[PDB]
Amino acid sequence: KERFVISRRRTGFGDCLWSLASAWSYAQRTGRTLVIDWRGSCYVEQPFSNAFPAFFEPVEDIAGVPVICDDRVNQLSFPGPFFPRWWNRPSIDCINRPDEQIFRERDELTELFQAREDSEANTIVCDACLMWRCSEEAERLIFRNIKLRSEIRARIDALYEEHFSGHSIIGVHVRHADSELALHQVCMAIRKAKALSYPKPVKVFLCTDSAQVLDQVSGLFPDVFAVPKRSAEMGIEGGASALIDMYLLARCATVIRFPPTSAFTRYARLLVPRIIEFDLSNPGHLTMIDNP
Numbered sequence: 001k002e003r004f005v006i007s008r009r010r011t012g013f014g015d016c017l018w019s020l021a022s023a024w025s026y027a028q029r030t031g032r033t034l035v036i037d038w039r040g041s042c043y044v045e046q047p048f049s050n051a052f053p054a055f056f057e058p059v060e061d062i063a064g065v066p067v068i069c070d071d072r073v074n075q076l077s078f079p080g081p082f083f084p085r086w087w088n089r090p091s092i093d094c095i096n097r098p099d100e101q102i103f104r105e106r107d108e109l110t111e112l113f114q115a116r117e118d119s120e121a122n123t124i125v126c127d128a129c130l131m132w133r134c135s136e137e138a139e140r141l142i143f144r145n146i147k148l149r150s151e152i153r154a155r156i157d158a159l160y161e162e163h164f165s166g167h168s169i170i171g172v173h174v175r176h177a178d179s180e181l182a183l184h185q186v187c188m189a190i191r192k193a194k195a196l197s198y199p200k201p202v203k204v205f206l207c208t209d210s211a212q213v214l215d216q217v218s219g220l221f222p223d224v225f226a227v228p229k230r231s232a233e234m235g236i237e238g239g240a241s242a243l244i245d246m247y248l249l250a251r252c253a254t255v256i257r258f259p260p261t262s263a264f265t266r267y268a269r270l271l272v273p274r275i276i277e278f279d280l281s282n283p284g285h286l287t288m289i290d291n292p
């Protein structure tokens with residue numbers, strides 16, 4: 001009989017894709033079908049629409065694991081019993097789903113994934129953060145075996161030809177008196193990054209939500225660039241521009257993570273040759289990690 005693992009996540013794409021890689025791994029390991037359920041995504045206005053096909057091409061199989069990733073989540077009844085055991089409660093008992101319950105489920109799923117024996121539950125529902133609960137091969141398999149929609153890929157390609165080709169790009173991811181120090185730290189990270197050697201002429205690719213950070217970093221360093229800014233359509237367009245930056249960061253020669261705890265730059269950490277960041281354990285000090 002067919003048995004399932006459901007990967008639910010509705011936050012930023014880095015978290016959604018790392019978490020999916022943990023769902024996928026358990027499905028691989030126990031001979032289950034993997035269901036990608038992105039209903040309720042922060043990027044899609046309508047609440048019951050599965051967001052995965054809005055940004056990615058259809059996928060029916062990942063490295064041997066069958067995959068359901070479309071609006072079939074709205075017609076199929078996935079069978080119980082369920083794990084975690086909360087998912088066996090009546091639906092009126094499931095309206096209340098506080099953070100304490102989500103975090104318990106992360107911990108329960110983590111225990112299950114470390115256990116030797118498969119669960120007897122016919123459907124595993126993953127609806128908590130599962131970052132760091134899989135191998136790096138799992139993560140790499142997800143990114144290699146799903147594909148961005150043509151419309152998003154064309155923009156990545158255009159930008160790549162316009163700014164990346166023929167050059168070595170230092171990528172800078174900046175999330176967010178406090179603004180004075182932060183600006184200063186970013187500048188010192190960029191000077192460190194620029195002191196290294198590269199094969200091709202250098203340009204600086206800046207990914208930030210602040211117009212003021214763009215403008216100032218642009219005035220303090222040559223050859224800085226960013227992706228231009230262009231209801232439900234602003235949902236989609238926010239998702240798309242998030243993916244465009246996430247994927248371009250992973251084509252840089254060096255990437256600065258401010259901060260390093262962001263899942264947004266996880267893909268870049270996996271592929272890019274050099275990562276620069278603030279060592280939180282020794283705060284205020286810059287460290288450089290060479291990729292294997």
Ligand SMILES: Nc1nc2c(ncn2[C@@H]2O[C@H](COP(=O)(O)OP(=O)(O)O)[C@@H](O)[C@H]2O)c(=O)[nH]1
Pocket residue numbers: 011012013014173174175207208209238241242243245264
């Ligand atoms: N377009 C774009 N989106 C980003 C960038 N960095 C982060 N984001 C997204 O904007 C939000 C940033 O995370 P944050 O506001 O700290 O809260 P979070 O949901 O816990 O990650 C998440 O949706 C990120 O995936 C970026 O450089 N460009």
Ligand SMILES: [Cl-]
Pocket residue numbers: 140144
């Ligand atoms: Cl890889």
